[PDB]
Amino acid sequence: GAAPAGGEVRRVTMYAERLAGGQMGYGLEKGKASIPGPLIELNEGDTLHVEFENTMDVPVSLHVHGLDYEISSDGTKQNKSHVEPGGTRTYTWRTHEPGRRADGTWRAGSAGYWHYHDHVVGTEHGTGGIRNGLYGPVIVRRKGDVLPDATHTIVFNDMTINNRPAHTGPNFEATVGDRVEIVMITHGEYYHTFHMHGHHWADNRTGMLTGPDDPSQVIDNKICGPADSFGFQIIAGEGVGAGAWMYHCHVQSHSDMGMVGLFLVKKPDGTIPGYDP
Amino acid sequence: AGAAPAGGEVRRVTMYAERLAGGQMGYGLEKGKASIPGPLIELNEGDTLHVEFENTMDVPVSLHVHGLDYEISSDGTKQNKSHVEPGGTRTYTWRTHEPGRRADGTWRAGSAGYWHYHDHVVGTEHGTGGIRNGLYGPVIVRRKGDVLPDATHTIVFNDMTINNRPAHTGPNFEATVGDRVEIVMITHGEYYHTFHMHGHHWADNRTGMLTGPDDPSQVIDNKICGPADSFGFQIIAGEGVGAGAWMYHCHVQSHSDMGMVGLFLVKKPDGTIPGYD
Amino acid sequence: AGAAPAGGEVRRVTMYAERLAGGQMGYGLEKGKASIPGPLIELNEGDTLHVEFENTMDVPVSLHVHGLDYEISSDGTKQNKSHVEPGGTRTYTWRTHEPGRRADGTWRAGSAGYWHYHDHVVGTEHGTGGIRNGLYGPVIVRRKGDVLPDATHTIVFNDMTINNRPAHTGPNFEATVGDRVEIVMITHGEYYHTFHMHGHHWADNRTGMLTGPDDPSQVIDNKICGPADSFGFQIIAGEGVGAGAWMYHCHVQSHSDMGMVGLFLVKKPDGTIPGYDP
Ligand SMILES: [Cu+2]
Ligand SMILES: [Cu+2]
Ligand SMILES: [Cu+2]
Ligand SMILES: [Cu+2]
Ligand SMILES: [Cu+2]
Ligand SMILES: [Cu+2]
Ligand SMILES: [Cu+2]
Ligand SMILES: [Cu+2]
Ligand SMILES: [Cu+2]
Ligand SMILES: [Cu+2]
Ligand SMILES: [Cu+2]
Ligand SMILES: [Cu+2]
Ligand SMILES: [Mg+2]
Ligand SMILES: [Mg+2]
């Protein structure tokens, strides 16, 4: 399928909740917070009212990249758009289509791979909140964008993937030929290089070349730093077949210390040749 | 606003290297008016710039530029004996060119872009001391038809400082909603950074603006950069987000916590900033 | 200058992993001829390459490639048993494809680009020791019509070294004004770097050259890179700047200070270089 035109006013409830071991997460339903937080998907033109509630005992905020928001949804203590413990606030995110300005220039649309995160826990830049897990992905689609069979979010948060213990993935499953979308976000203190065995994408907005006139580099390794986000769609096993296809940071001490996961690509019969964990 | 005209003029300017307060060093176009960053040099593709350089300091200095056309005698390195002894003078010559089709059929790219100049001999034979002290400045080379901004602001991430300013001391930049604001972003020293602007976004290409609906460049509000990287872009102040004190900062978490933050102060037409002191 | 032809040929090469002087390890295409960086492999989109691999060492080694098409049995990892035991042999197969349209209407990029191969097994399950020792090399996949260079030079930022060399020992590369020179730039190890070339510049895209007036890619002379990044470009030696000893270096200041520097020696037609004494 493909993304339609946007322009709908959407509403969602979001909660900030404490998780085990001093972690913190966002969720759309009480008791269902996750790290990373829930995936938010919009079409260019949609407005999103996030009916936010802070269930925790310390102030929290919601700050987003890329989308249109007024200063009252900045989500910063500096602009008093944070949320006291037990408090509620409606954060409003807007998005727009590309189009030609009055001055004749081309205004870019909001479409892209974006993210939201806390901006007040621990420090007035959310350093503690981000460490604890207060981050999630946002995808804004342009009319006509191809929709994937599945979407997986990989966050390099310092020297962890999605705040998980070292050497515990996460792993993602697909069948050869699935259209798999990856959302890749970085957070914290470190630079990383994201690498996928057996797969490759275009270094552009969608991760696929628009066609024979697109000059973007085709890569399988990409340097990223704190708050970078990008994404792409790949065809699982395309040209390479089934297997346990590693993805990892390629900084050698990072992969050695467990910033590694598996893209488990199954044959139609469900099997993965050579996988023996 | 307006549009850059075709280039090809032979320009001259005087430049001085001078000590500034606090052990710093800076370039200036007039004696006693050195600044950090140094003066913005603007050229149209095809222009030549003769820089009549004077070192007013007691140690050797040099002038090295990125991206422009210069002969080995304008390298600005002791390795090529193109540095300037204390109290000495030298004319550095920079040339630029338009794009065009080569005889071998390939396309020769033009000089247009966001570039920079800096010292290459103070402290070490790579200018490590000079760059630390403040000897760096921006160069913009425009292509005919490029959109001209209402103002240009230079943001240099020099090690753990912005423009050699003390931690948490800006700089701040003011604009009015709707202003076409041009940002030149340069990085120097030892560390990688990620430049982020609240409430604004740009295209990751030469100009920071999409050329049109066919341009696949990623639209971003966060960009990793390392020593001697330079990029620039233009934004419409407050476009889709309104007035406010819009933070910009390095997004490496400890760097924003330890002072690499500033404010893009976007005023209403009446000159006020809602929710700002 | 010449142009790459269409691909589609089945190629075969023998590759040896061998210990080198100074506690290093390298790949070579002929026995006793290993080098750091490893030999340059050049393919046209559509070519298949069968690498008949020989491990002459006393530890397991592997061959892992970026960007190219390979089945899991040619992954080159211990995890799926595609490493090569000491004294062993294995045939790794690399395939490449041309650009085209998918049935779902989307464009499938071709394999063309600046890629690289390296060990994935020595020292750790990610080849940390093998890469550090010198088990890396470049792979160029050309698209039909790509312009061919007069020379190709590979520059690998491996931890704090260039091509595993001692600090302040280059390498240097020579050219004549007007030569079309190709640079393959690969990064490995632990650290980020920024690659800078005095006097020259390129486009931040697949080929390093703008396709024409509609290509909006940034033109640069400085680029941040991290472990396993690869890019490449072509420059006309001395174009608009003339002959000379043109430094290239990492621009992280302590890195250039510590010797991550080399010389692009661009000669005049008489063979001399202005302002440079050998
Ligand atoms: Cu912020
Ligand atoms: Cu990493
Ligand atoms: Cu790999
Ligand atoms: Cu952020
Ligand atoms: Cu230099
Ligand atoms: Cu920083
Ligand atoms: Cu932000
Ligand atoms: Cu420089
Ligand atoms: Cu790997
Ligand atoms: Cu370096
Ligand atoms: Cu330079
Ligand atoms: Cu690799
Ligand atoms: Mg691009
Ligand atoms: Mg990039």
Q: Which residues of A are annotated as a binding site for Cu(2+)?
A: 63, 65, 117, 119, 192, 195, 197, 248-250, 254
Whether residue C187 sits in one domain with residue C100 = no
In the reported structure, the alpha carbon of residue A191 is separated from the centroid of ligand 2 by a whole-number distance in angstroms of: 6
Whether residue A181 sits in one domain with residue A130 = no
Q: Which of B112, B131, B146 is the last residue of a domain?
A: B146
Cα of A170 to nearest chain B Cα, Å: 24
CB C249 within 8 A of CB C172: no
End-to-end CA distance of chain A: 35
Q: Report the number of secondary-structure helices (H) and strands (E) in chain C.
A: 2, 21
Instruction: Give the integer Cα–Cα distance in Å for A146 and C72.
Output: 28
Whether residue A177 sits in one domain with residue A81 = no
Residue A98: its chain B contacts at CB < 8 A?
210, 213
Cα of B268 to nearest chain C Cα, Å: 33
CB proximity under 8 Å: C 150-189 to B: 180
Task: Tell me whether strands A260-266 and A172-175 are parallel, antiparallel or unpaired.
Answer: parallel
The neighbouring-strand residues paired with A69 are none
**Does C79 contact A at CB distance below 8 Å?**
yes
Q: Which of B146, B171, B199 is the last residue of a domain?
A: B146
Beta strand extents in C85-240 (DSSP E only): 89-95, 100-101, 107-108, 113-118, 136-142, 151-158, 161-162, 173-176, 180-188, 193-197, 202-203, 219-220, 222-225, 230-236
Whether residue A5 sits in one domain with residue A121 = yes
CB B157 within 8 A of CB B188: yes
For residue B171, say if its preceding peptide bond is cis, omega within 30 degrees of 0: yes
Whether residue B250 sits in one domain with residue B197 = yes
Instruction: Give the integer Cα–Cα distance in Å for A266 and A268.
Output: 6
Cα of A172 to nearest chain C Cα, Å: 17
Instruction: Give the integer Cα–Cα distance in Å for B173 and B193.
Output: 20
Instruction: Give the integer Cα–Cα distance in Å for A74 and B274.
Output: 13
Q: Which pair of structure tokens corresponds to residue C15?
A: 């590759």
CA-to-CA dists, residue C204 to A217, C92, C148, C196, C197, angstroms: 8, 31, 18, 13, 14
| Exposure b/e, B167-190, CB count within 10 A at least 16 = b | eeeeeebbbbbebbbbbbbbbbbe
CB C116 within 8 A of CB C66: yes
In the reported structure, the alpha carbon of residue B78 is separated from the centroid of ligand 13 by a whole-number distance in angstroms of: 35
Half-sphere exposure of B125 (CA within 13 A, CB side): 15
Residue B11: left (phi > 0), alpha (psi -120 to 50), or beta? beta
Q: Indicate the SS3 state at residue B131.
A: helix
Instruction: Give the integer Cα–Cα distance in Å for A109 and A256.
Output: 40
Whether residue B142 sits in one domain with residue B163 = no
Instruction: Name which of A105, A111, A125 is nearest B209 (Cβ-Cβ).
Output: A105
Whether residue B124 sits in one domain with residue B234 = no
Residue B77: its chain C contacts at CB < 8 A?
198, 247
Query: Per this entry, what is the length of chain B?
Result: 277
Q: Indicate the SS3 state at residue B256.
A: helix
Half-sphere exposure of A45 (CA within 13 A, CB side): 11
Whether residue C173 sits in one domain with residue C218 = yes
Q: Indicate the SS3 state at residue C128.
A: helix
CB B259 within 8 A of CB B160: yes
Among the listed residues B106, B275, A177, the one whose alpha carbon sits nearest the alpha carbon of residue C182: B106
CB B118 within 8 A of CB B135: yes
In the reported structure, the alpha carbon of residue B116 is separated from the centroid of ligand 14 by a whole-number distance in angstroms of: 19
| Exposure b/e, C96-110, CB count within 10 A at least 16 = b | bbbbeeeeeebbbbb
**In chain C, whose CA is at the least distance from the CA of A200?**
C67
Experimental determination technique: X-ray
Q: Is C255 annotated as a binding residue?
A: yes
CB proximity under 8 Å: B 218-237 to A: 218-224, 236
Task: Kindly identify the ligand whose nearest atom is closest to the C-alpha of C77.
Answer: 9
CB contact under 8 A, C210 and B107: yes
Instruction: Name which of A192, A218, A223 is nearest C109 (Cβ-Cβ).
Output: A218
CB contact under 8 A, A256 and C126: yes
Burial (CB count within 10 angstroms: exposed 0-12, middle 13-18, buried 19+), residue B105: exposed
Whether residue A121 sits in one domain with residue A3 = yes
CB-based contacts of A201: which residues, under 8 Å, 6+ apart? A207, A208, A218, A219, A220, A232, A233, A234
Instruction: Give the integer Cα–Cα distance in Å for C262 and C244.
Output: 13
For residue C37, say if its preceding peptide bond is cis, omega within 30 degrees of 0: yes
Instruction: Give the integer Cα–Cα distance in Å for A32 and A227.
Output: 24
Rounded to the nearest 5 degrees, what angle is found at the Cα of C153, between the Cα atoms of C152 and C155?
150
Q: How many CB atoms lie within 10 A of CB C9?
A: 12
Locate tokens 């397991």: which residue? Answer: C60
Backbone angles phi, psi at A193, to 5 degrees: -125, 115
Q: Which domain holds residue B201?
A: 147-277
CB B18 within 8 A of CB B26: yes
Whether residue A152 sits in one domain with residue A129 = no
Q: Is B50 annotated as a binding residue?
A: no
Instruction: Give the integer Cα–Cα distance in Å for C64 and C119.
Output: 6
Among the listed residues C88, C185, C78, the one whose alpha carbon sits nearest the alpha carbon of residue C127: C78
CB A33 within 8 A of CB A25: yes
**Does A208 contact C at CB distance below 8 Å?**
yes
Instruction: Give the integer Cα–Cα distance in Å for B66 and A267.
Output: 51
CB contact under 8 A, C245 and B79: yes
Diameter of chain A by CA atoms? 60
CB A126 within 8 A of CB A134: yes
Whether residue B129 sits in one domain with residue B7 = yes
Task: Please report the DSSP string for chain A in residue order.
Answer: -B------EEEEEEEEEE-STT-EEEESSTT--BSS-PPEEEETT-EEEEEEEE-SSS-B--EESSSB--GGGS--GGGT--B-TT-EEEEEEE----EE-TTSPEEP-S-EEEEEE-SSSSSTT-HHHHHHT-EEEEEEE-TTPBPPSEEEEEEEETTEETTPPTT----EEEETT-EEEEEEEEESS--EEEEETT--EESSSSSS--STT--PPEESEEEE-TT-EEEEEEETTTTT-SEEEEEEE-SHHHHHTT-EEEEEEE-TTS--TT---
Task: Please report the DSSP string for B38-98 in residue order.
Answer: -PPEEEETT-EEEEEEEE-SSS-B--EESSSB--GGGS--GGGT-SB-TT-EEEEEEE---
For chains B and C, count residue pairs whose Cβ atoms are closer than 8 Å: 126
CB-based contacts of B115: which residues, under 8 Å, 6+ apart? B65, B66, B67, B68, B138, B139, B140, B141, B230
| Exposure b/e, C224-251, CB count within 10 A at least 16 = b | bbbbbbbbbbbbbbbbbbbbbbbbbbbb
Instruction: Give the integer Cα–Cα distance in Å for C155 and C257.
Output: 18
Cα of C25 to nearest chain B Cα, Å: 31
Locate tokens 């009916």: which residue? Answer: A51
Count how many domains chain C has.
2
Task: Kindly identify the ligand whose nearest atom is closest to the C-alpha of C228.
Answer: 12
CB B232 within 8 A of CB B149: no
In the reported structure, the alpha carbon of residue C72 is separated from the centroid of ligand 9 by a whole-number distance in angstroms of: 12
Residue type at position C105: G
Instruction: Give the integer Cα–Cα distance in Å for B109 and C220.
Output: 10
- Selected residue of A125, A127, A213 to mutate for chain B interface (largest B Cβ count, 10 A): A125
Q: Which pair of structure tokens corresponds to residue C248?
A: 């290239």
Q: Which pair of structure tokens corresponds to residue A259?
A: 């910033």
Whether residue B273 sits in one domain with residue B167 = yes
Instruction: Give the integer Cα–Cα distance in Å for A220 and C228.
Output: 9
Locate tokens 């409003």: which residue? Answer: A92
Instruction: Give the integer Cα–Cα distance in Å for B251 and B236.
Output: 22
Instruction: Give the integer Cα–Cα distance in Å for B35 and B43.
Output: 20
CB C39 within 8 A of CB C28: yes
Q: Which of C123, C146, C169 is the last residue of a domain?
A: C146
Instruction: Give the integer Cα–Cα distance in Å for B170 and B166.
Output: 8
